[model samples]
Target: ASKLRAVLEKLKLSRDDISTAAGMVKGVVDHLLLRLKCDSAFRGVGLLNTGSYYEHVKISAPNEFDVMFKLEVPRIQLEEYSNTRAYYFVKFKRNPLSQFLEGEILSASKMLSKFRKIIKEEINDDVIMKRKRGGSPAVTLLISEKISVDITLALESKSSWPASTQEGLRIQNWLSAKVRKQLRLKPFYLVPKHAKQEETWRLSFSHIEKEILNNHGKSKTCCENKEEKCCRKDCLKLMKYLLEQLKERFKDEEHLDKFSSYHVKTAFFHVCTQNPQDSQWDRKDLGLCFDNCVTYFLQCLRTEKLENYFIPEFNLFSSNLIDKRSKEFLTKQIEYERNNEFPVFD
Candidate 1:
C-alpha cells in the first residue's frame, strides 16, 4: 500500500497540475542528489503533501494520519527504479485521556509559569533589553552578536500520561501554563504549541542552501563588465520570446483559460534554464530554487484568482483547528526519517 502511494505521488497523479508537480519534485530530488553526491547509494527524494489525510480521522480519537508519509530511499539503484518502492504506515488510535487533559483548565495555569522561565533562559534576551532601552544607539553593538538559539525539547514531563490519571492532569496543567507564559517571550516564538498538546514530539531543522552556481552567461562579463545590464537584457529577451511563443500556441483567450497549461509551461522554462547539467550558467543550482519558484507561482495564481480552477486535491485538507503540536510532530517525524533514525520507535 505504501509503495503504491509512493508511485502515485512520484507520478504526481494526486495533483491537478501534474506536470508542474512532477517538475518541481524532480527538481527537488535532483538538488538533493547534488548535495548528497558523496552518498552514491542515495536514490531519489520526494515531498508528500501530508495535508491530504488531515481530515477523515477524529481529532480526539486517533484523529488523523499522514496518508503520503513514505519516502522511497532505495538501498541500491534499480534498472526499473520506478517500480522498486518502499512502504510505511501509521495508525492513529484515540486516547480518551488526551481529551480530559485538554478539558482541564487548571493545568494551563501551571504550564504557563514553566513556559515563561524556559523563554527567559532560552529566547534571545538582548532584543528585550534593546526594547527596554528604546532605540538607544549604544545598544547596536550589544545586539549584533547575540546569536539566537531555538531548541524544541521533546521531554516526557508529568503530562505524558492519560488525562484520567492524577499525574496526567497535573502534567497537563503545568504544560498549559508554560505554553501561555512562554508566548509572551520573543524566544518562545520558536517553540510550537503542537508540541505541548501531542503525546509525541518531533523536531526538524532547515537552513538556506546558498546557490553554488552563478549565471555568469547572463552576467555583464559575457558582454562587457556590466552584470546588471546583461542580466536585464537577457531577461527581457527571454520574456519577449516566451510571450511570442505563448501567443503562437494560445491564439485564443479560451485556449489559455486553463491555468494548469500556463503553469506547466512556466515550469518547463524554469527546468530548462535551471538545469544543473548546464555549464554555461553558473547558477545551475537547484535545491530550494525550484521549490521557492513553485511557491511563488502558486501564490501568484492565488492572487490572480486562478487558484480555484487549478486546485490540487491536497488543498482539501486545510483546517483551522490545526495547532502547533501537530506541525511539531510532523516536522520531527520527517526529520527522524530523513536522518535514517526512528527516534519514536526507539
Candidate 2:
C-alpha cells in the first residue's frame, strides 16, 4: 500500500486527479464531436442554385471512410405560355450507408416522379402548343451508378425560348413541396443578386467538377510552335486532307447541319495539334511564322481543297543568332552612352 501511494505520488496523479484529467479530455473530444455533427447537418441539408446551366449534387462526409449518395436531374420538360421548353433541375445527396436503406431510393424516385407531375400540371399547355405545331416531349433520363449515385434527366425543348422569373419561382415552389411530402427534405431557394437579369441557373453536387474543368483549360497550350516546323506542317496537311474527306463523306447526309461550329473547330484544332514537334525552334522570327501558320491552318481546315498539291511549307525562313543579337547590341550601346561609360568597358 505504501509503495502504491509512492508510485502514484511520484507520477503526480492521485485517483481524483486521474479522474479529472480523463473528464477534461473527454470534454474536449465531445466538443469536437458536437461540432462535427453540426457541420454534417449543415452540409447534408441545403439546396444551392448556381445561375448557370446545369444542376449539381453536394454532400458532406464525417470521415474519409464515409460514403455519399448524389443525384441530379439535368433538365425537366415544362410547357409555358404556349411553348414547350426545358426548365429547372433537381439534385440530391445523402450518406451512402443510410441511402441504401430500402425506403431511400424509392423515396427519391417517388419525389422525382411527383415533382414532374406537379410541373406538368402547373405549366400552361396552351402556351406549349402556340410555340410549336406538334413538338412532343423529347426529354431523356441519364442515370450513373458507380461508387456514387448520379441521376440526370434532360428536359429537351424544341425552341430556345427564355424562361421568366415568375415561372422559375413556381418551379422552385413545386420542387420544395415534393421534397417535403416524399422525403421530408426541406429545400430553400438561392436567388442570386442578379437573378432577375440572368438567363440560366445551375445546381452542383460538389466543386470538384468545376475545379477539374478550370484546370483543363489552363493547362492546355495553344499550339506549341507559332511557325512552320516539320511535325506541325505534316499534322496540318493531314488534318486539311481529313476535313475535306469528312466534308465529302457528309455532303449528301441529312444530319450534317446538326453539328455545331464549335464542334468542328475543336476537331480541327485537335487534328492539327496532334504529334507536334518535340524540339524548340528559334523563338524570335518563329513568332511571326507561328501566327501566320495558325491563321492558314484554320483557313485550310475551313475552306474546300483547291488542289491536292497542298505543301505544309508554302513560305518558310531560317535565321541564325546574328540578326537576333543586333537589336539587343544597339540597345546596350545606347544605355552605355547614357551612363557615361564606353561600350568596351564591360
Candidate 3:
C-alpha cells in the first residue's frame, strides 16, 4: 500500500509540462478549427475537447488529446448497422447543405478521406498529420516529439438518444436520475468509422463522458470538503497509467496492440457502479480502490469479454478484437503487478 501511494505521487503530471503542452495543442487546434470553418467543406464546424486529459485523470504526461471536429447537420436518421448499438449508418432526412458529402447513406470513408485531405492542406509544419492507421477513426496530428492530437470528424444531431442506450450508463446509483436525463437531452455525435465492408458511423458520447468525469461525485460535496474527498479519479489514473506502462513494455507484441485506454475506462465504470458509495472510494484508501479496479480489469481479460459500457453487445476484449494469447499474457502481467506492488509503474 505504501509503495502504491509512492508510485501515485511519482506518476503525478507536472503542472509546468501540463500548461506548456496544453497551450501548444490548444493553439494548433484553434488554428485548425479556423481553417475548417473557412473551407466550404466544413463551414461552421465546432470543437469538442475530449479524452483523459480533459477528464482531469491524466497521468504521466499531457501529450495526448482528443478533439472532435463537430459538424452540425440538419435533421438526420440513424439506422443500426451492427448488432452492437455503438455503430450506425447515417442518413439525412433532408439534404445537408455541406459540400463534398452527397449520398443516400453518408459514407464514413468518403467523409474521412475528404477530412484527411483538408487537414493535410491546412496544418503547417508545427503540426503534421500522421499516416492513417487501419480501423482507427482519428486523423492523428503530431505537434512535436511526444504531443499528438486525435482529430475526429463528428456529425452532430438534435435527435433523441438511441434506444440501445436505455440499459446503458447505469449511473443511477452514483449520480441522480435528473442529471442523467439532462445529459441525455443534449445532442449526440456520430463519428466516421467502419467495422466491416460497409461504412458505419460510431456513436460517440464523449461530451457526456467529459461532463460526468468533470463533475464526478456521489454527493454534490463529495470532493468539496477535506473530509469528503474521494479517490475515484486517482484510482482511474492509476489504472490508466498501469495500462500505459504495460503497453510500452510490450511494444513489439502485436497481439496486445488492440488493448487501449478505453478498455480500462469501461472496467472502471463497471467497478464504480458496483461500489457506488463515496465511502468506498475515500481518499485514504487510494491503493485499495486502485486494486479493486485492477482486479475487475484482470477478470475481464481472463474472461476475454469487456463490454463497451454504453453498448453491452460490443465486446471490447472479444477474441476478434484481441486474441486469446495476448489476453492471457496481459492477465499474467497485471496480476504480477497487482501482487508485487506495481514495480512497472516505478
Best by lDDT: 3
Better of 2 and 3 by lDDT: 3
lDDT of 3: 0.77
Best by TM-score: 3
lDDT against true structure, model 2: 0.26
**Model 3: clashing residue pairs?**
none
Q: Please report, as a residue range, the 10-residue window in candidate 1 with the lowest summed lDDT.
A: 204-213
Question: How high is each candidate's TM-score?
Answer: 0.21, 0.20, 0.91
Listed per candidate, the RMSD to the true structure in angstroms reads 24.8, 27.3, 2.5
- Per residue, candidate 3 scores C-alpha lDDT tens digits across 250-339 of 898775688878888889989988998999998989878988999999889988888877777778887777789989999999989887
Candidate 2 error regions (>4 Å) = 1-51, 54-117, 125-258, 265-346
> What lDDT tens digits, residue by residue, belong to model 2 across residues 269-316?
332233223232223333333333444433432342111111121111
**Candidate 3: misplaced stretches above 4 Å?**
49-58, 96-102, 134-137, 144-146
Q: What local lDDT score does residue 30 receive in model 2, on the 0 to 100 scale?
A: 35
Model 3 lDDT, residue 154, Cα: 83
Q: Point out the worst 10-residue segment of candidate 3 by lDDT.
A: 49-58
Each model's lDDT comes to 0.25, 0.26, 0.77
